[PDB]
């Protein structure tokens, strides 16, 4: 069977698969008081993508579509495309689109649209609140608040690229809610082919995340984006397609310099990873390190402690 | 270690010269224009060249502080790493890893987070890579913004590209011109080399994507020599190699036929065997796949 590996490049080198930014560095913390269920970045280690999860991270949290003004207002209500500006099939099953945005929050970046006839072009700042009744990808349309009431036209494609987030009212970093899945379908459905929640399980474990900071846009937005895997590993495991031989791939963290490992972890075969540790922690770890599949463990390996 | 590419589809791809995704592949003749990008420059041994780094999400990223030209609306950004530590402008490459290889106007915003409180903002922003405040090189750009007041001195600014404008049709940007990264103070330096077909009857094959258009009239073609998940396969494998020319198959996997060949040549682009523009025609599902290294004369099957 196909040796199970994972990618050598070092956290820096590497994307966050929630938003289309670099990672920063590694986080472990309690997520008791969360769901984590992220749709983006969701992949086994054989390669089956899960949740939203596509391939590469400058699609993350992009949108296509022609769009049209909602009355007289500076909003605009975007019927949904795929990528390669093909008809969107709702059908599929799903929860929203391949790289729709999977937390509650507003995303601000510029709406930009050609009119194919004379190849004008225009763009505008936008926002597109995803805890709003009009996000409803899964339907095929979301709504952005743009700087314009005029200038966009209809039956011509445009395209969202976004930027960072924002944030509103006295309580700061009160959003985005990273761990909050928007409604695919608004009030309409509840969410569908949802890629599970991941938890830890084990006594003394914690989740480890890749983190980034989000641009902040206006505001005081709570900007912390963690993701279970970086796009480059969803992207490894897709292409290798490497069999796994047990439920848990036990990675080492080692430092190029001396050898050495720095911690250990498990990741599981269904796209996560776990440390033995309690409390928030930011890793302190060498920029040249990277991990290292070392054996097929079970979910009951007793890690040495982080 | 035998040499590999990847087998993700043409749309499963990022362009490495901007971060959008790919759309589509052309040939077409380049002897009357000279082809150096700088940006998705890698030989498939793994040596990055240019200023091509690992992530299609820093290209044409611009990180720093940023002052007030004047009571104006446009600020000088002092570049910054992509992790905020220096830029060393000492080191033998033509500009900041991932700076734009194209003389255009690409606009984007720019944002900015105050440390103290955590106050953030976003203004509409461009920056003119044919300016003579286009220095990268020195530590410096300079973007045209819709602020005179709102950005602050000493706190963390980035520069998020979206796509191009235009002035005056389709006359700019100009892909296959360089910037001058010192502007007039000095010449381009470290470049990576210009690339051009040297067997007859042979094109370049390029990967091609639409950068989107923010006003104007602009030439939103972008092409690329390798896409960006290329350049991070032969970075990490690092496979030697045994010839100067890796023969490549496009396969559709739905029959297993070859679609066509084409030459990956070891400095890092792909040739075929055509003459004359052509967009070509792929399969979804359809990928590249290396079969053999080959000697310095061998001719491709016609496109
Ligand atoms: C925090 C600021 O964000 C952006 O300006 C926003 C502007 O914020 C105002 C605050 O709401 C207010 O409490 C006080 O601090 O003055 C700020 C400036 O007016 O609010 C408007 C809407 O009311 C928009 O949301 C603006 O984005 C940014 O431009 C500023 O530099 C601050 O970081
Ligand atoms: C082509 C337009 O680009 C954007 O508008 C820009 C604006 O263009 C104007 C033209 O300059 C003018 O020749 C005439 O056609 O009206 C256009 C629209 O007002 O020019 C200003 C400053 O010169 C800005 O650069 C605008 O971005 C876009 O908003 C329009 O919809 C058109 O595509």
Request: glycine fraction near 8%; charged fraction near 15%; include cysteine.
């Amino acid at each position: 069977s196909k040796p199970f590996t994972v990618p050598i490049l070092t956290v820096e080198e590497m994307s966050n698969s929630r938003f289309p930014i670099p990672l920063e560095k590694l986080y472990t913390g309690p997520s008791s008081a969360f769901v984590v269920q992220p749709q983006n970045g969701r992949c086994t280690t054989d390669g089956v993508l899960l949740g939203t999860t596509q391939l590469s991270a400058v699609n993350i949290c992009n949108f296509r579509g022609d769009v049209t003004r909602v009355g007289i207002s500076h909003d605009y209500t975007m019927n949904l495309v795929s990528q390669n500006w093909n008809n969107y099939d709702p059908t599929e099953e799903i929860p929203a689109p391949l790289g729709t945005p999977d937390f509650v929050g507003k995303i601000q970046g510029l709406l930009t649209q050609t009119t194919r006839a004379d190849g004008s072009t225009r763009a505008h700042k936008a926002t597109v609140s995803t805890g709003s009744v009009h996000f409803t990808p899964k339907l095929g349309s979301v709504q952005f608040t743009t700087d314009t009431n005029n200038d966009f036209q209809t039956g011509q494609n445009t395209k969202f690229t976004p930027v960072g987030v924002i944030q509103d009212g006295d309580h700061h970093q009160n959003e985005p809610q990273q761990w909050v899945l928007p409604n695919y379908s608004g009030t309409s459905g509840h969410n569908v082919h949802l890629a599970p929640a991941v938890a830890p399980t084990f006594p003394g474990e914690q989740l480890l995340f890749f983190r980034s900071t989000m641009p902040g846009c206006s505001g005081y937005p709570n900007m912390n984006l963690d993701c279970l895997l970086p796009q480059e590993w969803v992207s490894h495991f897709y292409q290798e397609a490497a069999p796994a031989q047990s439920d848990v791939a036990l990675l080492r963290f080692v430092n190029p310099d001396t050898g050495r490992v720095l911690f250990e972890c498990k990741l599981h075969k269904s796209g996560y990873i776990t440390v033995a540790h309690t409390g928030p922690y930011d890793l302190v770890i060498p920029p040249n390190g990277y991990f290292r599949f070392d054996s097929w463990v079970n979910q009951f390996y007793t890690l040495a402690p982080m």
